[model samples]
Target chain A: GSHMINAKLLQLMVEHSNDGIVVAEQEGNESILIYVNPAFERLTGYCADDILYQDCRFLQGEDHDQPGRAIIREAIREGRPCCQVLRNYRKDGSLFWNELSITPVHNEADQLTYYIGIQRDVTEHQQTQARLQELQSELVHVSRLSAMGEMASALAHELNQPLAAISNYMKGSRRLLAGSSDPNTPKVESALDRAAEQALRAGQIIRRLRDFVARGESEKRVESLSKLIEEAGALGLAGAREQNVQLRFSLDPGADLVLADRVQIQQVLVNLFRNALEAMAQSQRRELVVTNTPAADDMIEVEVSDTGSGFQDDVIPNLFQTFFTTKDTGMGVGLSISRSIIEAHGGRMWAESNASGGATFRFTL
Target chain B: HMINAKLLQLMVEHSNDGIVVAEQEGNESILIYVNPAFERLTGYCADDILYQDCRFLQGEDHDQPGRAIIREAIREGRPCCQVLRNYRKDGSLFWNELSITPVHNEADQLTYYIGIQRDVTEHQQTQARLQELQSELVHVSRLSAMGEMASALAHELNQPLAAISNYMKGSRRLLAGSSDPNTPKVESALDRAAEQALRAGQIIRRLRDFVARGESEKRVESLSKLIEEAGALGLAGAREQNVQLRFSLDPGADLVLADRVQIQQVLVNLFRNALEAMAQSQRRELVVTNTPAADDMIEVEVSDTGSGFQDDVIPNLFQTFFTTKDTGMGVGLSISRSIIEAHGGRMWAESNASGGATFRFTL
Candidate 1:
């Protein structure tokens, strides 16, 4: 009599609980609902008569594409307990998020007899999670911009070297002209031409700096892939010159134009170039090959192949993750930001180890 | 009409910005009005501020460059805007973007100096940080160039020096052996050596000039292009927030004489703030309108459909460190106003009719 009273109290507690509760008989392959508490009716807009001896899959409604439903079914087949969040609808066709936890009951003979489930509505929780995700994304972007600002100053110094070189060449040409037999002579003219070329080079470097550092909204425009490769190559010339890294650009003329932010694409390229140069600092060969080619699905693909110490198997998986780096003097945001930039522009970026002892980073847009 | 009035009242009382009003009784301006935002910003209630000189907010440290500007404007009976350092009742210092315009009676006698104030501490710090980062890189990287320059100069002169030395040796061999035929060759070698020395001097002088010139001055720039550039910077964040930015630029008003970089910085700040203000709201819309203002100035209005400021807090909206957001240094509007004013422009804000806030500036 005492045990029966305890069972009554347990059933009473389940009936009065806020969470929806259901008990189902384990019949062959299907679990049939045998009993439903009052809270279950309140939550699903269904009384015991409506759901008794029926499969609980009715909760999934006409939207049969619930991937988690398969998970629940598999756990039931294995006669095991499981928890999942699935889409469920009310009698009025209104959708509600259901976090359901189900457990199996065993008899004294060690046979599975019934399955019990507790359900909770979690629609508001999902929205809050989505909002937090958006905020986190914005925060990451802010950090990237901050890093870019810090790098811009170092870039300015890199820009000054070419400028200083131009000034020297011009002064030398001027002196050569002042004492030459004739200003129009071959020697003086050649020196002047060299100065002019250096001046143009300096101008290119300055223009690149201005374009990269200016706080501009990211706008996606159709851009020539070959042109982008050339500009990105030019942006990293100073770094290449300093490190004595040989840059080989092989842009296919037939490469289609891709939609992307010009500066951001250049940023991705520049980051790749810098990483390659730094990685091969101690290596014998320092060659960076950048190529733009057409890929499958009418996409434009670009590859940055570097002759450096290739990444390890373990390191490759986390390469694109934030704050993941192998360098001593890097914030580790460059590659992650580059990947984000590419992803934002409707593209994908990945890296692969080269056959000849190096690494190749490829992206398609 | 009653509901409309109450709604307006509710907006002002719950505004995120601070508001204040002062009456002129003598040489000193007395605080006659203070809103909930004022109390929130300075930790001082209406009773604490009322009937007292507005200068009390300045605390013990009275002398500041901004104070002199404020005093001059008060004496001249004209409107002047300044950024001043003021202390709160808690003895904490905050940067107040104070705009004071003397309100006169119909007879033109000054009766009140209505002051709108905002906290701008964070904005000032952000700017200072940017400058320091830029200067640090310039000094750290370029100063090392001095040593590199010395080595480069030595290397450059070495080729010519070696040529000169070799020529001199050959000339000496002919002279010592009494070969008069090589006398012209010796003279030519001496001329070449002198030219090499001149080239070295030019290199040193160029280095000196490069090191001495610290930064460039402001120049004329196109306003439309600057706006485009600013929008480009905020594009990533805007997309993440699902916010839409619509820009309407007046075709005729294209150019302005200003620092291109600084203007771009200001625009970026405004765009970012607009996006942030609407991040939580379902109706996330930002509209930026540019038009030609009176007296050869270009005016820009950045409006957002977010939580508009309460009427009571409008006066203190731009104050430094005054933040309604759960995160961020709230110096955006405060510094943005300062930058516009620095460029000989004025900035103000108003609540939108439907919802949200609008920041307007003339440059």
Candidate 2:
């Protein structure tokens, strides 16, 4: 008698309460709805009279985002308790983000009984986070563009210097023509030829740097490795000299070729070489070696070695992982992307312990 | 205070409360009469209305509170007035301004409800209209910021086009001097020039993109920084106008996640507005203030110390096709409001208490 509660009171309480409470019975085929509280109506704007014997799918709207609804459907299809943050709609057709968590309830014999669903509003927080992430990305883009400004001016100056020197040489050749010099005289002829050569070289260098600076989206061609290395060497010569690093280069003694974007490849090479020079700046010996060879039967190997400490057991393994760096000023993407570039080219790159007590990076391309 | 008989009848017909009468009949002179307005106001039929008299309408929506004035007046056999809200036939409602008086007779006493029913629809309508206008102004503010970014991107791409011309000229002149020059080298130079020319064309294409309509879901951007850039780009115009343009920006103003080009357009528009306003005035000074508001929103205020807005024009400053200038498009402010509203912000103009007009926007 004590176990039996009054039916009317229970019905009245469930019909009026604000928090959604429902009971379902596990049939052989489905978890059938037994009862639902009024809180369900208040929260979902659907009355118990309309949905007493129905599933909770009544809350889901057609406008609900695909991934969210998919997750719920997938969870249910797998015969498990499905909890998801879903995009749902109200009775008035206003869409909202719902923090839904559903759990499977079991009976005494550990049999699946029913599922309970709880939901809260989290739209504002999610949107705010999205807005913040967008702001952060914009800040990064603006700062990145700002950094380009100084480098652009320096590049323009670097290009203009050779141009001015070419101008002076041409002027000098013209002046020498009037000073007892034949057009075919050996000295005058050599000076005029050199003047033209320098002018043309200066012009070519300007165009090369311009292309490098633009870094436009374009297809990668199989670029000449010989030219890339030579250009990288020439580009950083001033920086090395200013930093008091005596740079040296030993090429493969012939043409080296790789199918890659010239600017990106040069970027990779320049980054690696710069790191080497900087790391060995304090070492007694300062040297860099860039050499290419055939490897793996079908791949080309280009090795960049530095007269610095060889790879340590721990550090070398994680050199390609993001945020893994020994240097305080290093961004770890260089080594990571260097590996990615080699791998993307259908090759492999690695750091090796040098036999000569330094470090060697070999990438098969 | 002043009313004719027709006006009084109209007022009675529209007064918010139910009007009813209690006519005495027998020696007891029990409740006799009530009006249809009484039944309609009290959620009862007139047959049911007369049964309870007027006391039933006083149950809720009215608080006798601490005042027993009506009860005391009834006890003292005097007249009294009271205001209240009562239920209607559909469980909806009305506010009743009720005045009850005791009409004494030889046999018994009688009471009546001279209730007035006046609809407050106009008051509610005014309130709703004000709210809608406020929301629109906020949206206008957001677009005002987005317009600034559009202008910056325009100038950003223009510089590259300018450089392409110089590159092409140099390349052609290099080829011109060659007498049976190396074909490969000449071709390379021409090819490089062509690349630059393509870059110039790309910039033109991007300008076309700028003119295309779009929304902020494309990107979030720094508004204060955008304004600074626009200021730098528009500085020459400010100087040309002989007006001193100044910017006071908040260092940590939260970014407006808007289409960058749109913000640039707004900045340009504001700058142009200030320049024009100041050009004809004696002060020749304009100031831009960008600060984060206490509500965690950003405010951009373009204030010109010019002959402020003509007092009469202030009300219609942002109205479509309403302008104080001879050559004004008038669409700028209208479009600016349209854009800002699209971005979910408010834009409005105010006459400065001292002098000059300040167009302040919050996004």
Candidate 3:
């Protein structure tokens, strides 16, 4: 109790903090910047000496339409603590999402003296959330398409028999009546021929719908392969980072652009990456190597190689089959759906065992 | 040295966050002062808790492993934050998000620690609840998709079935009453076409059976057992998230002749939705209650805290392509409703006066 206050360490905490801290003193009808730490200048590109005693709205620039601004204005007026996310601009005119948590600082007389604002740049988090939603919608798109393809294939086959039988009967009748001696035989043969053609046309309709379900369900774009892999790898590496899985990416400079549904491609990559990590869950070696190379006919092939327990001879046959899972509690839907997606985009997907006691999953797009 | 001391004391006193100033004593650390907010938070007056160590708030629930880490950090005189379960004066529990910042004197002796306590029990609960919801909701629900496709598939087969009949009848009409050898052969062809029409008719009938699910092999299932298994499956990750599950099933309502799979699906969906709704509420309790209904059936009620859903959300909840969640397909609730409809039962929801929601189903 007798010791003096140690203000040096407090200064260090403020000076080195990643969050931009600003203390705004409430003057009559104005809020002036009384103090700003080093991070404030680092975040907004303003010198502390030059920005003191000034308002902090330079962070908002000319963009005053943000709803969060109204929230802050009322919070300051009410002398209450509030937090809001605002679209803020740096001195360079670049935009960022600023999450500001402001607290009311009181004086000895219990008057609202100042507001200490803690600002954090949350642009990356906002973008990540947006990307995740986009990925979700795209996955549902591909999932529905895969289901339709399976269902349509079954319907087309089931409906094909009746159309085929009707066509054969009509054609047989037309042949039998062609050489008849009766006068109405010519008219009968002609009508039978028309019936057979009508039945054949009905058969074609179902198969056409089946073909429609197989292709071009999602819009395609020219996405950078490196960028796509980088994003997918970042997302898939969340839990595997602690598993000591060493990841390597070998990009093909000659083939960089991929005409793909970026979300679908990333979906397949993430699932494969996860399976690769999980495959190496108990292995001594946990090296996951991703390679991109040029394939024949101007296609680009991507491969995910993992040093895990390689697929068994019998297991490899059913690896891409639907509902064929090796896990005790899984649907094994990824590889099945993954193959369909690639094939729908006029591409191919397959898996192979590595000579060095591992396996590699490959897809061409 | 006293330049801002007056203002600093004022800042701590009226701060919205709870603050306690504790200094090292002979054998332990004792609290010297607690702000009015801290007193109001724990229901302890400053005079009552001033001389005592802050660990008293931990009370009898000291079996937490994190407390050991916290104790070690405090003994080593390091600054750290921990979310510790603490009790109020009335013995109620709260999650104290305590941040302990060490204050070293000019002599480099750690003299005091300012503990900033934020009651984040609500936030912690909401986070765990959302995580559980996210894991469950991430699997896209395709039951509605299947239903819609079933309708579309049935519609598509109608044209082909009609065409089969049209072809067979036309062939038979063109070769009527002729005694030539070829005419008999043509008649034989027409007979085969008639059989094909019959085959196509049977196919449509089977499709209807599958879609209308007059195809689901339903049997006499115990409502209690179904609810038990469905509750277990629905609350797969609830234990870790601190959701309270209460079952008040009546033995009389336990017997009902129902489709085990379909009824179980409806129950699980209701439970998941209740858990999902309670994620936003500070009080999370899931109650499953059953009673005998008027018509030889059982009426089940699934209730949850944080109000079940808003009044406006009621209109669109059972509608196809309707969802309140950012991650879900909205196909789940609609499909569950349809499952009940197919079972000759009714399903609905109500906003409970408990500021939560209660969903009901009869089977």
Candidate 4:
């Protein structure tokens, strides 16, 4: 009588918990739900009558990877414990991260009664952790740039001394070359030739240092827009395959030489392009398009678009607001920083809803 | 059957409501025992009013001209039931129904006056509610009236602003044509135009927003940043007095659950109060701290190290039209306290022994 009462109490406890908990039996190929808690109704938007006899696999959508699915399935098949990050859909078709921890429970007989699942919606916690990680990553980047700045500062002085020396030698040697003494004296010719070579070398060093400091400023000059699109597209090629994202480029004829820093401009394009790539990270048709066009106002424009789940209507107002983000792993600073950089270079940055869903960010300089 | 001596005494002594068991000798009632309720109901516990012949729950308010019946009932050694006004320990009045009856010891002569009193405050309130039907309807009517006054104030301030804008624009157009360019005069004109334009814009903007009575629904608002902007306005004055406005702000506070404009108004009110408190002292210092009080909750504490309060000013701090300042209409702090408390939060002040005040609020 005590054992039966204890079992009843345990059953009551499971039914009363304010978390969606379920128990499944190892059926032929799928884990079929045998028990479900009342909290399941509140959490999954699912009721006992709806999910009791069905396989829990219905929660998985097209975005769900089958390889990750097998980890849960194999554990359940062997009557072993399993904890998985499952992509489960609710009754309303909205998705949530169902952290399913299933353990095979048995009575004193040592026979399996059901596979108990202590499923909690760890969406909020997961998102918070993601933000913390992003902030930590951003801080690292900031520190790296700071360290790089000290080295660049030292390098700036070292390069400047030699540049100054070469310029003086060139000017002095030019006077001797034009003078009546010999017109081309051996010493004068040697100094002029030597000075020219050193000057060219100094120019290369200055260009290199300019690249280093460009991160701190949007250094816009003259950039060939057509070539930039190809280069930025190729840059994301490896990352695209890695994320299973497809990169598309729509290049216009004569993507004109616009006044913008090549590297900093590339960075703005890359950020928007990468954002588009990440937006389509979970889509079946995961495509990110980086398009280049010639603007009428003596400037070139670049637009990045994606085929993914679009922004909620209210999100548009704060899409570029500093520290406002819609993604779990988003720093929310990327779009803000990108817009700031673009605007600093006498350009404009704006985002609008894509005709075919998702969002597109366009900038011109 | 007439009650026996022991049972009758026990009845009056053990009763829940106030019961006075007294011995009657011809005309005067000599009190013997009073129940615990008698002292508690009248704020005079057991022995405090034991020897008194008449009711102790009577003062200037209770001794009214209309209480002639209540006086005659206890005078006679006969049964009388009448409602009498009574005073308590704190000098608050309440209605009490007193019943006096005579008792005899099988001698057919009066021996005691058993006074049984019942408090009827609850019954009186029931009648009052039944009579006054407009109490709930007029509660929010006063706020609507204030809103109307604010609209009128906005209109009154908007006229001069529109005229200034017109003059600034015309002057700028006049500066465009100059044969012998007077550089200094042109520069002065330009500066004046900009200043006038900015002033007009600022006044018009404040007017437009305040008159809009609609309270927008809750949206994601950066309250921490808003409060910082409000504090920045007082930075110059604070620095002059060597006071630092330390903003203990939460960097990651995001409450997407508030009326944005109203919250901004609340922050402005709080910021002004802190600044005002600091302005009164030589060592002017105002400290504002905003932190998460709980999950789904945020709290802001604005304290100043200025001339703090004595014990008396604390209670009446939020009272209407009450002021510590000669110039103020005294509505600012009172309205602020009401607005904060209206949003399910309490606003209160405490004094520092070293002389300063801290106004604390939590939402």
Candidate 5:
């Protein structure tokens, strides 16, 4: 145990913890297991008798592909503490995500005495993260829009407000410090200099953040629309498998090879597909169908259709307005930015609502 | 509903007063477990409270009349209750009415004591209120709630006024100060503008003197305890920075007569600056160590493996007021140095033999 003075109490606390608590005695190169509480035994399905004195890596086995493995080794060699999410195998050869945090105990002489670790099985947490990966690059899209919004002249207009405010504040402060009755006015006047100079520094700081945000757009090449949907469907259908839904993709060979940026098109398709899946969440029927038809004038039209609750009567009127969203959270500039991107490519993006069922978001190139 | 009488956990879970089971370990009542009510009442998180001696609550204020009674109550192995001055989670003083029940086995060896602490300061407030507020709210001025409304105004209006004054200063530079040409009228106009912002900012600051509890609540506390706690918290960012961190508790130098919470803040500030200092440097390492000092004092050093300082920044590092920092209005080290000085100690810096910097303080 860690402390000899209260070993029994420590043991009891470890025995009752909701998470695994293991104590291992640290020797030169190898750390030997000394104590394994009931939670650790139950969590990994490894009995104390079977692995009590073995190196703790008995739990990790030979599958050491994790970068965290060397991280743990380095931290241990340095006699420091570390926390890592290691892929640990159970006794039955099933994998469990172990959110392990280990702290080393040192004596008065600062010698490594023990390595005490807590193991929390985060397989459920891992799955929750995978679920959130359904909206892959959605955050990236929002932040990029934020950067675009931070363009130089646009920010200069905003910066002027605060900059003007700062100058007035400084002027008012400088007057009173100098206008005082005492002859020490000039010394107090020096206080105004630093803050006054900082006004320009504050303006300088604004331009710095604005400068880094406008590095310009990435170049686009002729990209495959098939692979784009294939990638978009990967996460979109994850949204499909999450809630109850059926997915149907109708691909025409003529519409398969569109000359546009792959990531940008995938971004728009995933947004539409996810919105379609969300639209069908509580309806009597749940179907998401994508139709591709070669249109006139060297353009191919793609429509994403959903079978769910149709849009509200006035929603479509304001649907593409900036910052307007149907989601409960604050709306990202989602569809507004999508339409603008499509327009910038000299293409078209529009939407239609079905009277009997849900909605269809369409784009042409 | 029927009960699981075997689960003694419920009484602890539902109790209003703070409850702690301090195990008798080596002449020290090392706290092994603290119930939820203790966390609620004390404002101390579970991590910092455990394994610490229960007397840390009494802090340097061990000269209270209840000390001897509490000492003998445990010494003679009996139940006892006392009202003592104890510090709260943030080092605010509170009169704590403490009740202790010592437990022993059939073999008649004292094992542990169950402590229930009721913050009696509020209880004393009932009597103090009648003596103070009862007289004040009466014998007063025009409207009955006039003083209350003034207090409310001072508190509410202070923030916006401060913001306006802050905004006014920056704009003064843009509109007047930074201008190459200055007219006689411009200087006079700018002077009044500065005067008006200060008048409001000052008025709001002056009107708000009603709340009398000062933030400093000093007591004799363990330097090691304060350092280790703050050091552990600061290391999370060090790890994120991929720093090679080394921390050591010296062979001696245990306790100091200072506020635990306040000293922890100073330690934490130094730690944060060290973290920032090493952010872009080669050999990204930060070391913290506590060593014994002369005249029965303890010293702490936070050395960073980074550029020592800007040549001009050495003297002005811990210089003065709500100033200099990107996020601060001079509040960071200006107050930190005062806290050290008030404890009859000194906090200073030295450029270590290594090309980096070191901040040292002795208590």
Candidate 6:
């Protein structure tokens, strides 16, 4: 009894749909627009008469190189359904991000007659995604700077030792030159040699420091994992020796290759080596062991373990939290920063205590 | 010309914006026409919402700001636009930009209300996220300022250190050429002076490197040479710890394209990590091996004879902040992984079968 009302209502509903709908007929090799709803007119400011019998490519804008467009074209060519996000333009020449879904309609005889497209504007979403990427990059840069600042004091202390030694050597040389007796030939030579050696040592230290902290846009290149560990250990040599710590390296040789930023990777290892030295300072026997092994999923794993005071169970949970510190001299942000750096590179880091004593830190990339 | 009739019919059937027409009778409106767009927008069918007041779209909130505006527009019988928070059938909220106009009969009597709406929820969220990013940027600036101060101090330390080293060397040379009889004491003093000057210079250099902000340059380097240099530098520290070191390089093509210094850096870091792990072991031995991995890449390994890594610890070893050592900065392996990935390679580790831990990587 209400069939007529139902038909009219269905017609009204489709005409006023919020998603732009277009009906196109297959004309030879091209799909030409035959009908466009009022919503299409409002969305693109193009009337049905304006776009009738025309291809929908006009909305693709000047640069039709979108990979999504190719996908739509392929699907349409094969008379299949396709959905894609494409850059489209309105009649007034304003660009919009369009989420277009097209479905082919066939006649009773299975011959393609028309193609219907549903378009939704998504420009704001795309813009937001772009903004997010920029923001993330900026955040990483700032965090690195923050990390460098925290390490400044330890580096100052490291530099002070050589400087103080230099002062002593200069005073000794002056006194020898001022003395009445001529300087011993071998003795003078030995002193000069020692002095030169120390100078060289300081230079090496500086070079290593530069390698780790010298900043520009960080670059990725093929690198050796074995090389990374060796250098990082060298950076923490003084600190480890001060605590009477022994550092060991065990590598697969074949597992040492990777793609990474050299300095940043060294920074991570140096942090771990230094931490091990500090943890074992009070222990009778202090040893830090590092190893590399092939892991599942075509990845490699590196572990840093120490024979020292292991972490308390309660403190383990908050270990990587920013500003979580167990030592007085620490800023409590090292682990947080390290985790961020690792995660950014698509890796993972975690810690666990050894059975006998001490703890092990590990990561995979 | 006859297309006008068909155009009107098409507009009513397939408009993209949600549209509605309602009969206005005695200050009350009853829905008369609802477009397909209206149903899609709110997830409500015409049969369910037709004849019902449009206030149903507001969920349980009838006193919303947009509702007040709508009432005012109806009373004035004029067109108005407002953005309102509306709810869908699934209880999700959406921002709807609504425009309404009052239509009158021929005698100027109010007959119906026509409304059009577009969803703007995503737009609202984008703005909110942008605001968050702006605030975060301000916070990051403060941290960078502190970093700048550290860099300045490092630069200041370099100048004096270099000068002092040069003076010591000159004094030693002058004394060596003197005509006075040689004495052990004089020679010792000269030697001490030279040593201290050199040490000071070295310290300053380190500070400079630590504070420098420059890009690392990459170049093709020999794999064999890189291994040798890295071993020499890394073993010095291991020797001090009394750890036995061994290296094995495969007898095959040993040439690799890489940054010489950076490659050495990774090697040195690995050796140090191995040394640290063997700190408490009685029979401490660290073995390093390099072998062919694939046609286009090579593999390297560092294994230790010490307390093997616990199962749980293996997964977190490369995490920047994950550390078992009390003094660890927790950034070593994290940065190492980053470097490896940048080079289009992989790195990971596990417990070795020989009662220790082994770390490996491929390049």
> Over 4 Å off in model 6, which ranges?
A1-21, A26-29, A37-50, A61-65, A73-83, A89-96, A101-189, A196-365, B1-363
lDDT tens digits, residues A160-189, model 2? 543454345344434443343222334433
What local distance difference test score does each model get? 0.63, 0.53, 0.71, 0.56, 0.62, 0.65
DockQ winner among the candidates? 3
* Candidate 2: tens digits of C-alpha lDDT, residues B116-214: 233334444553453343223323333332233334333443444344344434434543444432433433543454454454345434433433334
TM-score, candidate 5, is 0.32
The sequence of per-residue lDDT tens digits that candidate 5 reaches over residues A1-365 is 12222434433333545466666767777788767767788899988888877787866789766668899989988877776888888989998888776666554433546676756677876775554343342433333333243222233443455446547755665654543444434443554555556555545654653453333454567666676777778755664643647788898876777767666677677667767776777876888888889877787888888887877888877877654656653233457667766776767888879755699888887
True contacts kept of 6: 0.23
Q: Between the candidate structures 2 and 5, which one is better when assessed by DockQ?
A: 5
| Top candidate by TM-score | 3
lDDT score, candidate 2: 0.53
Which regions in candidate 1 have their CA more than 4 angstroms from the true location?
A1-5, A108-112, A130-153, A161-165, A168-186, A209-365, B1-363
Error of 5 at B278 (Å): 9.6
RMSD of each: 30.3, 30.5, 11.7, 32.0, 22.5, 22.7
For model 4, residues A8-121, the per-residue Cα lDDT tens digits are 223333344444556565567766786676667777887777677778777785666644588876776676666567667888899787666665644333353456565557
Clashing pairs in 3: B307-B355, B307-B356, B308-B356, B308-B357
Off by over 4 Å in 3: A1-5, A77-79, A109-112, A142-146, A181-198, A207-222, A230-264, A270-300, A305-347, A353-360, B1-143, B162-363
DockQ of model 1 vs. true complex: 0.01
Q: Is the docking of candidate 6 incorrect, acceptable, medium or high quality?
A: incorrect
DockQ, every prediction: 0.01, 0.01, 0.19, 0.01, 0.03, 0.10
Model 2: fnat (fraction of native contacts): 0.00
Better of 1 and 3 by DockQ: 3
**Native-structure RMSD, model 4:** 32.0
TM-score of chain B of each: 0.43, 0.40, 0.45, 0.40, 0.43, 0.41
Query: What does the lDDT read for residue B29 in candidate 5?
Result: 77
